[PDB]
């Protein structure tokens, strides 16, 4: 309807995206590299741990700016066969530029580790606020959902698939706006790809079924997210991943009684097993989503410009978790030099 339509506002999108692509490609082809050193950073505390090492709150000594430094033990990345994913992660993250994406501010490596210095978000991740509060109101969830729709419009126009959408991966900034943090499974691919990766609750059925897949898996994951934000639980849950997968591939979804009829219609079109019928994957692409009823109150340009009043602003002062802290040990011999040469 309004979705299968041009041209004046659709042309501005086109122009924005073409300029963004030109920007992106320069950085894609000539990646930033070795742009800091460990000793430039005062390590304040551990924020969290991933499979490859700690994420630390750090302070850049020469600007006093605060960042989150993701450390990756090279040997653990090799054992986990995540070399190419790690290289994707960094190559893509240094190249993108969007208001709702965590910036890769510096990267470097030493004998033992890879280091990714990221934009610090004082609010922490959405997961925590969502579990604490229980669930978000539809307008609240719509606000965040709108930011993901624009971010996906941006990433997809660059031939990127994100592959890890979930509340754990979305940071809330000082203005109450979102930043997508984790590029671990991001990939640049024209056409189809096959890696079984992602987080069980958020996997599209074509991933579970080893079908080979594209960017439409991101759109399904948006469906899970919106449902999770508004329900306070995932549309498919169980105690074990294999029980989750059977629920995902069955083709059935029950909605809570408080979901508006517009919300349910949106979600049915996002959580659609049939790629032929899944919103975001049709002739109108993202516009099927953008001009849906549930989004009728959304001013997209205002969202992009951060003009909309955030429903929640993080308290700034204690509140941090405590971890055992230990000094970074750097081996005297270089590990996995060849495998990571391009980092």
């Amino acid at each position: 309807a309004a979705a299968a339509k041009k041209g004046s506002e659709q042309e501005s999108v086109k122009e924005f995206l073409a300029k963004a692509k030109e920007d992106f490609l320069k950085k894609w082809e000539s990646p930033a590299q070795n742009t800091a050193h460990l000793d430039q950073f005062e390590r304040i505390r551990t924020l969290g741990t991933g499979s490859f090492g700690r994420v630390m709150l750090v302070k850049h000594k020469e600007t006093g700016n605060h960042y989150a430094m993701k450390i990756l033990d090279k040997q653990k990345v090799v054992k986990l066969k995540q070399i190419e994913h790690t290289l994707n992660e960094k190559r893509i993250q240094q190249a993108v530029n969007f208001p709702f994406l965590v910036k890769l501010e510096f990267s470097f490596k030493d004998n033992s580790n890879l280091y990714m210095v990221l934009e610090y978000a004082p609010g922490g991740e959405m997961f925590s606020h969502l579990r604490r509060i229980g669930r978000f109101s539809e307008p609240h969830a719509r606000f965040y959902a709108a930011q993901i729709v624009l971010t996906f419009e941006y990433l997809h126009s660059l031939d990127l698939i994100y592959r890890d959408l979930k509340p754990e991966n979305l940071l809330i900034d000082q203005q109450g706006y979102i930043k997508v943090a984790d590029f671990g499974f991001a990939k640049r691919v024209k056409g189809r790809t096959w890696t079984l990766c992602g987080t069980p609750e958020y996997l599209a059925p074509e991933i579970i079924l080893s079908k080979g897949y594209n960017k439409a898996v991101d759109w399904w994951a948006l469906g899970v997210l919106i449902y999770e934000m508004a329900a306070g639980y995932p549309p498919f849950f169980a105690d074990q991943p294999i029980q989750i997968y059977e629920k995902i591939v069955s083709g059935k979804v029950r909605f809570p009684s408080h979901f508006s009829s517009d919300l349910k219609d949106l979600l049915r079109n996002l959580l659609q097993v049939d790629l032929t019928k899944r919103f975001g994957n049709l002739k109108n692409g993202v516009n099927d989503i953008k001009n849906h009823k549930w989004f009728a109150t959304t001013d997209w340009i205002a969202i992009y410009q951060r003009k909309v009043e955030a429903p929640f602003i993080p308290k700034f002062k204690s509140n941090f978790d405590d971890y055992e802290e230990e000094e970074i040990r750097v081996s005297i011999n270089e590990k996995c030099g060849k495998e990571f040469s391009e980092f």
Binding site: S51, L80, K81, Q82, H85, F127, R131, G134, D164, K166, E168, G184, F185, T195, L196, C197, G198, T199, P200, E201, A231, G232, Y233, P234, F237, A238, D239, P241, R254, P256
Partner: peptide, 20 residues
């Protein structure tokens, strides 16, 4: 309630990605 079933399940904390 479905919420009570969720809160009682073993998947209410941070969920790890798989890559096999």
């Amino acid at each position: 309630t479905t919420y009570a079933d969720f809160i009682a399940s073993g998947r209410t904390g941070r969920r790890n990605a798989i890559h096999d």
